[PDB]
Design a protein around this ligand. Structure first.
Ligand SMILES: *[C@@H]1O[C@H](CO)[C@@H](O)[C@H](O)[C@H]1NC(C)=O
Ligand SMILES: *[C@@H]1O[C@H](CO)[C@@H](O)[C@H](O)[C@H]1NC(C)=O
Ligand SMILES: *[C@@H]1O[C@H](CO)[C@@H](O)[C@H](O)[C@H]1NC(C)=O
Ligand SMILES: *[C@@H]1O[C@H](CO)[C@@H](O)[C@H](O)[C@H]1NC(C)=O
Ligand SMILES: *[C@](C)(O)CCC[N+](C)(C)C
Ligand SMILES: *[C@](C)(O)CCC[N+](C)(C)C
Ligand SMILES: C[C@H](O)CCC[N+](C)(C)C
Ligand SMILES: C[C@H](O)CCC[N+](C)(C)C
Ligand SMILES: [Cl-]
Ligand SMILES: [Cl-]
Ligand SMILES: [Cl-]
Ligand SMILES: [Cl-]
Lengths: 528, 532
């Protein structure tokens, strides 16, 4: 049967699904690991044990336990990212979309959701893989991984909570694809991993990790890179936060085993309730439990690995959105509101930069402020808003990614860079937020291809060329089929805009601000 | 007899000089102090003692001993600033231009030449006061003062070389005008002191010094202010340089008496020959012997005096030129040339910044570089050249002056700020240098009024309105003639911070002169260099 497939762990029964007046096969919720519950919490994933009989893969799996955004109840703009199904610690499953009829040894694309390592689900609507698999004729796989304390509580030294188990879950899903994709028509030697935000940083982290390199061919990073200021913490900071989580819940802190046994007896929601209380400062775009530089998953510091060229060398395609910071200002900075232009006073601006760069001293803050303030008109609320918007975006996403792109390109086998700056016509967020973090995703997954969603014809065309750039890249290492997307080189550093207008080539994406964030500020904070 | 005037020191005989189809009286080379020669060198000035007979004041006096620029032999562009008379230590004289017939009690303007405190003369052609005195009917005075080591060697503690004696030479000349100017038809209760560059810093220094305050009514500062990074040094830095000068001449450095005795035995040109060897680092827009914060002429730090309003409270009129730094880049920065477009490579740009901000640590250097570099086009020779020009002008003149103007205005009784940006049609310097440091002076002294100088008709009108702004200000404290038709030069206020461009085009009112860069130079950089 086209829907009955024998994997190395047992049989799975898919389900024929409708897609743009046609159909394709869908295998939903296939377990790739043993449920990390009970004494397996915080522990590395163990491969799923073979099962007898046919596994029902007709419906979506549970979503991992996570913090749920209740800021705007009923508002689709924020809820579209919340878990759309029951949450459970038994959430290590993956989904596959195969074109019908089943192709032979075709290109595979593995999706890794973002969510700051504290949230995310593979079941979200904007992650529906049928459109992209059908349109570009590829086998699309979406995996899942533990988030929050469940996936990143780090107590280096211990083996019950070693940290980075979330990344290890992703690795096990990729390993599962390496061993079973061929049974669905996928070509295991031609696998492209791609993810947004934390999912982009994960992709970058697998590119760096030795144990992940042989599990994929090429990579796509969207609005995220391994070196982002929020994507990782030292073993020391990981332990401090881990112990503070214990303290917040009145745990025995005499030793790691005692601390862990205590944390394993608490209910999921009890941990999640105090998760944010472990951050060291009041801030925005900062998350509690993220990956740790342990010397194992990550041999040495991310920077040294990048300079020595110690990482997978292949073709990468990465980019960013025009306004990466608005989403986080809205949730944690004063003066911002969902129902107004959000003109920021001068005082709120000050408060904002302090929140954006929580680790910087006063001189550093003065530096950031001077760098983003037009002194011929400092009391302009619109300019203060946009300045804060750029600060959050340049420092947390754009510049860290540019540092990654320049470093990678020295050893890579081909880089393609993009700047996504299109404002969806049906966006439900206010206009001041601009091209929001994560909203290029709907275009990558072909959502504009469905009439009922009311997009414009120009946006449908945009989505079709983006999906084709992604797919063509995944199968050849070049988004161009034999206007051409120029290759990003160390010398010319070219990149293209990604919108409804004809292609345009630019050079040195936000080089001025990034020289400030990648060279000057770091140097200033080290010296003072 | 208009030309025969008896002063408190003795009689003086002036001369009738022609001026624009008319005539005016001129008293040139009148002594106001005793020759600071021999055992007087480095010492505070002493009042000129009464003389017998009539002093012949029909010719210019000698110029003080100073470094002479010979970079471009024969070039009018540079030589117009060199001594045009024999140099001598006996140089403490002043010049006076009086309208004819002699006014009864008119406005007086005293000119203090600039030249980095290491050069300058009251006798240059560009300082010919007959045009200004005649056109605005004011009594114009040209004073002089010891420059270089002769006027600023400072060994705090000693009374033989106390420092700031050049500033005291100026004070004594003002005291002379205060006591004798009435004899020339001018009102000592209405004297305006004005100067350019080091002259402008000087004027600002008299405004701050309790000992100069009662010697003048108002003040005009052109491209220079007291707080400029080059206008002064600490007593410690002054001593190091003083001692260093001795070491450069094999002097007994065992005590101030011996050192000073050794230096008084040397010939003028001998001191001058090693003057530049005492500077801390390789640099541009830095001079060896300048005023010192001695706690005497200057009660406390210049900054604390401005924050507390410890200074004369009157009306001031000040400003700067568009390209203050090009002149100093041509003389000491790699890549610059008089006979070229001077496109600066990235390599020379780096060197230039190091040279422009000699007191900066590596971090401070990166900060400056980043602040004036367009990273989307870093190898652009022209942007690199103009960047450097801006750096040197902002750090050394413009921003220090904006700091001054904003502090003074909080206590002053009237402030007018200008931005001179007109390139003379007959400039001899290369186009890249733009509106050069010091070239607004010719417009101030009416040079554009003499036909053979070939200025355009619009430059003559510009000169006339500038001289009128200056004089009217001197007379009333407001450069604008009440209820007149012409566009009004607005007051600079702490709130709106208005200023006007000064050129051949109609008047334009602007706000916050170079605030962006000046916030960098006045607020950010200092905090950065402080930390460690
Ligand atoms: C698989 O589960 C779905 C939903 O629970 C159900 O509709 C379907 O019948 C199941 N598969 C079969 C036929 O066993
Ligand atoms: C990728 O590697 C191949 C083979 O080593 C080489 O020919 C090609 O130039 C490389 N591509 C780029 C753009 O680095
Ligand atoms: C003053 O000096 C000038 C120039 O040397 C001369 O013409 C004039 O006669 C002198 N006056 C007297 C009477 O000495
Ligand atoms: C200057 O002082 C006078 C006298 O008190 C005062 O009336 C006037 O308002 C002041 N002018 C300015 C510009 O401060
Ligand atoms: C990234 C920080 O992983 C944040 C992604 C946020 N959503 C809302 C797009 C999931
Ligand atoms: C000022 C630093 O005192 C410079 C004066 C130089 N000239 C060329 C205008 C005389
Ligand atoms: C963007 C976002 O939902 C941040 C989470 C909000 N707090 C820190 C209040 C829990
Ligand atoms: C500004 C100026 O002409 C400097 C004179 C040149 N040095 C320092 C070399 C003697
Ligand atoms: Cl559909
Ligand atoms: Cl639900
Ligand atoms: Cl290359
Ligand atoms: Cl300022």
């Amino acid at each position: 049967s086209e829907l009955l497939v024998n994997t190395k762990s047992g049989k799975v029964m898919g389900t024929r699904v409708p897609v743009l007046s046609s159909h394709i096969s869908a295998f939903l919720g296939i377990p790739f690991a043993e449920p990390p519950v009970g004494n397996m919490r915080f522990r590395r994933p163990e491969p799923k044990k073979p099962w007898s009989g046919v596994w029902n893969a007709s419906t979506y799996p549970n979503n991992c336990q996570q913090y749920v955004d209740e800021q705007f109840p009923g508002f689709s703009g924020s809820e579209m990212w919340n878990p759309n199904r029951e949450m459970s610690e038994d959430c290590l499953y993956l989904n596959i979309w195969v074109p019908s009829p089943r192709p032979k040894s075709t290109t595979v694309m593995v999706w890794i959701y973002g969510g700051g390592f504290y949230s995310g689900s593979s079941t979200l609507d904007v992650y529906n893989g049928k459109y992209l698999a059908y349109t570009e004729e590829v086998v699309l796989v979406s995996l899942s991984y533990r988030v929050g304390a469940f996936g990143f509580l780090a107590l280096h030294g211990s083996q019950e909570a070693p940290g980075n188990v979330g990344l290890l879950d992703q690795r096990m899903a990729l390993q599962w694809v390496h061993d079973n994709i061929q049974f669905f028509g996928g070509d295991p030697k031609t696998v492209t991993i791609f993810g947004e935000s934390a999912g982009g940083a994960s992709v970058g982290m697998h590119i760096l990790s030795p144990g992940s390199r042989d599990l994929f061919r090429r990579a796509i990073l969207q609005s995220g890179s391994p070196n982002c200021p929020w994507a990782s913490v030292s073993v020391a900071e990981g332990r401090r936060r881990a112990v503070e989580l214990g303290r917040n819940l009145n745990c025995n802190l005499n030793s790691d085993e005692e601390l862990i046994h205590c944390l394993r007896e608490k209910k999921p929601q009890e941990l999640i309730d105090v998760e944010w209380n472990v951050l060291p400062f009041d801030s925005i775009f900062r998350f509690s439990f993220v990956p740790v530089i342990d010397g194992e998953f990550f041999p040495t510091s991310l920077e040294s690995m990048l300079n020595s060229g110690n990482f997978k060398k292949t073709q990468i395609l990465l980019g960013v959105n025009k306004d990466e910071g608005s989403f986080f200002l809205l949730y944690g900075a004063p003066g911002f509101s969902k129902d107004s232009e959000s003109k920021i006073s001068r005082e709120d601006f000050m408060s904002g930069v302090k929140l954006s760069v929580p680790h910087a001293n006063d001189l550093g803050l003065d530096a950031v402020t001077l760098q983003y303030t037009d002194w011929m008109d400092d009391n302009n609320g619109i300019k203060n808003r946009d300045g804060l918007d750029d600060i959050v975006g340049d420092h947390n996403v754009i510049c860290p990614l540019m540092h990654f792109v320049n470093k990678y390109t020295k050893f890579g086998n081909g880089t393609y860079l993009y700047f996504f700056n299109h404002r969806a016509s049906n966006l439900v967020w206010p206009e001041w937020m601009g091209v929001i973090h994560g909203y290029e995703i709907e275009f990558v997954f072909g959502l504009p291809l469905v009439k009922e969603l009311n997009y414009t014809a120009e946006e449908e065309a945009l989505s079709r060329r983006i999906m084709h750039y992604w797919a063509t890249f995944a199968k050849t290492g070049n988004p161009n089929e034999p206007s051409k997307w120029p290759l990003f080189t160390t010398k010319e550093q070219k990149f293209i805009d990604l919108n409804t207008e004809p292609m345009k080539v630019h050079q040195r994406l936000r080089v001025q601000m990034c020289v400030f964030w990648n060279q000057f500020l770091p140097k200033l904070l080290n010296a003072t």
